[PDB]
């Protein structure tokens, strides 16, 4: 292991949640850079996020220069650590940048290791944004939090779109293009995202289900994925209808304004 | 092999089944050698041929070949980039 003794102590204190030890180590120490990581291990922030330590994670986020903050956010969103998600969102990096709204792959020049993972890739698919991941997990609280920040799952373009961006994405790595479209629609077709996304979510769910069915007809390659997503939308519609216990609710669901 | 076959042939077959169960482990397949998908495919083919030959433990060898097929499909499935797909679909 290339790590030294003091950074090993700091990493184990953060991973095991020794808040006094972590605070002592990170305060007024010339050495012990906060973003020290093992060769094939996890950052201190990633360790304090994977195991829920809101105080330790907050102390780590107190430092201005920290690496893999986006990866810590994705780890917290993948889990139910709502307080950790809020703390990471409160970091100045997300607040004063387009980092939160846009995906790790296409947000910016991405020179900084913001969403980066251990060595090579990202924890999840590079196309998965925080809001898409939250919808994937159906994390209602996290989905609502990201919506309040303006982070909305952007609807993918039509299958027969001919604009410059879609064509450029189609030219190289078409498999990743299809995977990204499937992930985006999986985020849109989340019951949590459907309910919390916009007013009249039953109509939105019906229209999205129809669009997914048409895409299943068109693609003829990922037909099971789109059928599953349309099934999710149908389940959401029937579930929203089912919970009605009054005739006025039934009439409102069976016909809008 | 002949000396092992002379006495306790049932234990001989049991030992061969256990050794192949060890080889056809997804953990051993992944950690055993470089290019584990090719190794898994070849091992699955060998297990299927042995299932044809034995005609006594056919279910065991079919199960092991199924384990190798599951490992191959699982390693393929986790690909999220076209370069990974191309590398899996054809080696060096
Ligand atoms: Zn387009
Ligand atoms: Zn021999």
Curated annotation (Swiss-Prot), chain A:
Tissue specificity note: Expressed predominantly in brain and at much lower levels in ovary, colon, small intestine, lung, prostate, placenta and testis.
Binding site for Ca(2+) 1: 52
Endpoints of the signal sequence: none
ANK repeats: 5-34, 40-69, 71-97, 126-155
Compartments, as annotated in UniProt: Cell membrane
Subunit: Homotetramer. Interacts with ITPR1. Interacts with ITPR3. Interacts with MX1. Interacts with RNF24. Interacts with JPH2; the interaction is involved in maintaining Ca(2+) homeostasis in skeletal muscle and is mediated by JPH2 'Ser-165' phosphorylation.
Function of the protein: Forms a receptor-activated non-selective calcium permeant cation channel.
Family: Belongs to the transient receptor (TC 1.A.4) family. STrpC subfamily. TRPC3 sub-subfamily.
Illness: Spinocerebellar ataxia 41: A form of spinocerebellar ataxia, a clinically and genetically heterogeneous group of cerebellar disorders. Patients show progressive incoordination of gait and often poor coordination of hands, speech and eye movements, due to degeneration of the cerebellum with variable involvement of the brainstem and spinal cord.
Domain observations: The cytoplasmic portion of the protein is required for channel assembly and gating.
Protein name: Short transient receptor potential channel 3
Species this chain originates from: Homo sapiens
Organism classification: Eukaryota, Metazoa, Chordata, Craniata, Vertebrata
Residues of the full protein shown: 107 to 363 of 921
């Amino acid at each position: 292991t290339s790590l030294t003794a003091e950074e090993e102590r700091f990493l184990d204190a953060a991973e095991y949640g020794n808040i006094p030890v972590v605070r002592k180590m990170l305060e007024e120490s010339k050495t012990l850079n906060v973003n020290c990581v093992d060769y094939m291990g996890q950052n201190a922030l990633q360790l304090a996020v994977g195991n829920e330590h809101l105080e330790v994670t907050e102390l780590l986020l107190k430092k201005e220069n920290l690496a893999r903050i986006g990866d810590a956010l994705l780890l917290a969103i993948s889990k139910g650590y709502v307080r950790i998600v809020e703390a990471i969102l409160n970091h100045p990096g997300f607040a004063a940048s387009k980092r939160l709204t846009l995906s790790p792959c296409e947000q910016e020049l991405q020179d900084d290791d913001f969403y980066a993972y251990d060595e090579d890739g990202t924890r999840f698919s590079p196309d998965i944004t925080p809001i898409i991941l939250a919808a994937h997990c159906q994390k209602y609280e996290v989905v609502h939090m990201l919506l309040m920040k303006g982070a909305r799952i952007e609807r993918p373009h039509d299958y027969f779109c001919k604009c410059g961006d879609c064509m450029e994405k189609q030219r190289h790595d078409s498999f990743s293009h299809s995977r990204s479209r499937i992930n985006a629609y999986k985020g849109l077709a989340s019951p949590a995202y459907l309910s919390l996304s916009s007013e009249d979510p039953v109509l939105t769910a019906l229209e999205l289900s129809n669009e997914l069915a048409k895409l299943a007809n068109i693609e003829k390659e990922f037909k099971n994925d789109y059928r599953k997503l349309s099934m999710q939308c149908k389940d959401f519609v029937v579930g929203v209808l089912d919970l009605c216990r009054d005739s006025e609710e039934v009439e409102a669901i069976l016909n809008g304004d």
